[PDB]
Amino acid sequence: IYKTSKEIQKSDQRIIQQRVENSIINNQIYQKSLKRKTSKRKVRHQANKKNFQKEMSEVEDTLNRIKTHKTVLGYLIVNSEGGVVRGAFKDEEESKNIANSIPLLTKKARSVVRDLDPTNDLVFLRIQTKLNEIMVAPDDEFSLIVIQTKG
Amino acid sequence: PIIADELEKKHIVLLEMYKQDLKQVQSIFLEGKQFVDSMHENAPLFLNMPPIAGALTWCKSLRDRIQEPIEKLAQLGQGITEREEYKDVQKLYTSITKSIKDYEDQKILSWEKEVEDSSQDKLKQTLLCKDENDLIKVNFDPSLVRLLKEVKYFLLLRTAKDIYTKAETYRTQIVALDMIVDNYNHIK
Amino acid sequence: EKEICKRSVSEISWHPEGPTKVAVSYAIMRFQQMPEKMPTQAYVWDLLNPNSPEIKLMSPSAVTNISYNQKIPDQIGGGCYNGLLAVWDGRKGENPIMISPVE
Amino acid sequence: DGCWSPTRSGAFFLVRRDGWMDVWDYYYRQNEIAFSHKVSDSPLTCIKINQ
Amino acid sequence: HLPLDSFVQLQEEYINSKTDFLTSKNVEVERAVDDLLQTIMLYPLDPHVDPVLPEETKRIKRYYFWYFYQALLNSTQNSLNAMKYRV
């Protein structure tokens, strides 16, 4: 029997992937990622799988909610190395300009806060223009920038 | 009267608990009784003891557990005896005790007949040599060992003297007889 | 494995230095339920390999209780079904070095 | 056989002849067994705890 | 022993010690598998019910044996990583 053997092998593979997951509900984004990394022998199927490409609603869900919120032009995440992890703006030129220009200002702004007290580190920075308000949240791993028109 | 009213409620609950113990002992007894009669493995008798002697000892342990509460129960005042529920439990206790005695009587009764048969085995066992080689060995019936060990357990649970008196002499003679037999076979 | 009838594990003891070796003695406590010429040996197991006993202790009669001794490393003392007292060495196992007089 | 836990005085383990081992812990509830586990169908002759 | 003729002979002795140890574990794993099967067989269950299924027993051993293969290869692969580190 060859087919049978193959099936058995597949089953074995599935078991290994689970372990922490323990079958039941489709669950978890982190678990899925780990399985993909370590063992790539088997993938997909197993159970319902919930919603495709939705490991965790909460950070992803919150970002979707702020974008949906009224009077918000968009929220663009800037990678620590001047990159656009995610861009949500009507025009590419504004997003491209925001992607390069905004992080440079925050880094310069962080140093201004840093010069007065070395221990103190930037937690949140908000710049209000005459026609628009710019809010940037800075973290070493990622930077979140949101532009909201003043009410 | 204040505390006394609470006590009456407590007495019925205590009586109900004894009902569970009586039923549990009885249910355990029935499952245990079948194994003891057939001398099956993992039997109720504790560790290693004479099987016929052990059944009487095992019956006594079950009987002691059942009657420990009755002495305490007779202590209770306010005519708890009048209560119909208390009377029903007492009837169940009496039925369980009667069944145990009959089983004990069969064991002691059957054992009594076995003891008479055993007496003959001690009288006519002797020492028998077996195989082509003269490897003399004690032929004392293994049953004798159980009957002698059986009697000691009976003492713990509460014209044959002359025969029992030469029990000491028989043991000395067998040891002396065994030594010459080993010596007499080696040369042979 | 493949013992005549079955042998109950009457007593279990733990190694004094650490929980890496367990000494178990097999005998039948039932009166006269033991088969004639039944195997009467004690096996000391090892936690690392449970497939078979690391060493085998041989005694004249089945040992009802065997326990380890903290004072001397790997020394096991047991009491036989006959009433004989025997002592074995855990490192060498085999036959018992000390046996009490029968009578 | 029943033996006290060397590490903790409060809990002591008793192994029944029904093949079930029940752990009694007096730290939390004196009235009931902390937990009951069935080691095997065969009766448990003895229990030993490592020190 | 990640951290010439002499190194090979020393490595062989080190490998031999591991092999002697691994064999002891195999006996323990087989006894554990048999004990689990024995406990299920020991279960009284219900008289008018099947006591156990022969296929079920084979799957518990085969899958566990298959599981051991995943662990055994895993160990061999770790040595290759050490060899790459040594290189």
Side-chain angles (χ1 to χ4, degrees), chain B:
Chain B
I2 301 178
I3 294 169
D5 291 351
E6 149 51 13
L7 285 176
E8 300 175 8
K9 290 185 180 180
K10 170 167 168 288
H11 278 293
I12 294 169
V13 177
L14 291 187
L15 295 174
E16 163 47 11
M17 284 305 307
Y18 176 77
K19 258 194 168 185
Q20 299 165 353
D21 275 24
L22 201 76
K23 286 181 179 180
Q24 190 182 16
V25 161
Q26 182 188 11
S27 66
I28 291 182
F29 167 98
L30 291 173
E31 293 194 8
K33 176 179 62 179
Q34 180 43 17
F35 289 120
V36 177
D37 191 356
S38 296
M39 183 188 304
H40 198 89
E41 293 177 350
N42 192 31
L45 300 70
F46 59 88
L47 296 311
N48 64 34
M49 67 174 282
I52 327 183
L56 285 171
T57 72
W58 168 62
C59 304
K60 165 192 171 187
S61 66
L62 284 181
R63 173 155 33 88
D64 283 331
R65 169 185 184 180
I66 294 169
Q67 186 173 355
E68 266 200 3
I70 303 198
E71 284 187 351
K72 293 181 181 178
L73 280 205
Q75 296 182 1
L76 290 299
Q78 299 182 4
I80 55 81
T81 67
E82 293 177 350
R83 323 182 76 87
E84 293 188 5
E85 283 294 353
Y86 165 108
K87 284 191 173 183
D88 299 324
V89 186
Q90 186 174 356
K91 304 175 185 179
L92 184 167
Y93 155 90
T94 56
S95 66
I96 289 188
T97 61
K98 290 190 176 181
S99 62
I100 299 176
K101 287 191 176 183
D102 289 345
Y103 186 75
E104 295 174 287
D105 282 339
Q106 293 167 358
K107 290 295 187 178
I108 170 184
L109 187 298
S110 59
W111 182 83
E112 301 171 359
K113 301 180 179 181
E114 285 195 357
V115 165
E116 303 192 340
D117 298 4
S118 79
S119 59
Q120 299 178 350
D121 313 357
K122 158 202 170 185
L123 293 172
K124 66 174 184 178
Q125 185 64 60
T126 80
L127 296 203
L128 302 193
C129 65
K130 301 185 177 182
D131 307 358
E132 302 177 1
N133 298 343
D134 280 17
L135 293 180
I136 313 173
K137 180 48 189 175
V138 174
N139 179 224
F140 177 80
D141 176 359
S143 167
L144 272 172
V145 172
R146 69 186 188 95
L147 178 72
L148 204 54
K149 177 174 58 181
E150 293 177 350
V151 173
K152 86 160 193 174
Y153 272 86
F154 270 63
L155 285 178
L156 182 55
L157 77 71
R158 291 330 112 188
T159 75
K161 294 294 185 174
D162 181 354
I163 308 177
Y164 199 67
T165 59
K166 284 181 178 181
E168 202 308 316
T169 71
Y170 281 138
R171 295 176 64 186
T172 63
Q173 285 178 330
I174 289 183
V175 173
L177 206 59
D178 184 334
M179 300 180 300
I180 193 60
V181 175
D182 175 359
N183 181 341
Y184 162 98
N185 288 358
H186 167 95
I187 303 301
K188 189 298 171 182

Side-chain angles (χ1 to χ4, degrees), chain C residues 76-89:
Chain C
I76 298 185
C80 283
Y81 194 76
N82 309 174
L84 296 169
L85 274 191
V87 182
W88 306 269
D89 182 333

Side-chain angles (χ1 to χ4, degrees), chain D residues 38-42, chain E residues 39 41-44:
Chain D
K38 163 93 163 185
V39 169
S40 157
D41 276 340
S42 311
Chain E
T39 58
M41 288 307 305
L42 295 51
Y43 190 61

Side-chain angles (χ1 to χ4, degrees), chain A residues 57-149:
Chain A
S57 181
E58 312 179 10
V59 162
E60 288 70 347
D61 172 13
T62 48
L63 295 174
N64 181 349
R65 185 182 295 276
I66 71 194
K67 187 164 56 179
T68 59
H69 200 293
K70 179 62 173 171
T71 81
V72 179
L73 275 51
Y75 75 109
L76 176 166
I77 309 283
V78 184
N79 193 351
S80 62
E81 310 163 356
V84 195
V85 177
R86 261 177 281 266
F89 290 112
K90 297 181 185 177
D91 283 345
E92 293 181 355
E93 282 188 352
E94 289 223 19
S95 64
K96 287 171 189 180
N97 291 319
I98 279 176
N100 296 132
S101 79
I102 301 199
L104 300 184
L105 270 59
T106 66
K107 192 177 181 181
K108 174 52 186 170
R110 169 178 298 174
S111 74
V112 176
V113 63
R114 276 296 223 143
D115 294 352
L116 308 189
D117 192 339
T119 82
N120 174 355
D121 184 1
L122 259 204
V123 177
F124 181 91
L125 177 63
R126 153 155 32 180
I127 292 178
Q128 170 179 155
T129 83
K130 171 156 300 185
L131 281 183
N132 287 312
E133 265 205 338
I134 303 177
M135 292 177 72
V136 172
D139 195 4
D140 48 13
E141 280 188 320
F142 292 92
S143 303
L144 198 171
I145 301 155
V146 167
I147 283 195
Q148 176 163 183
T149 174

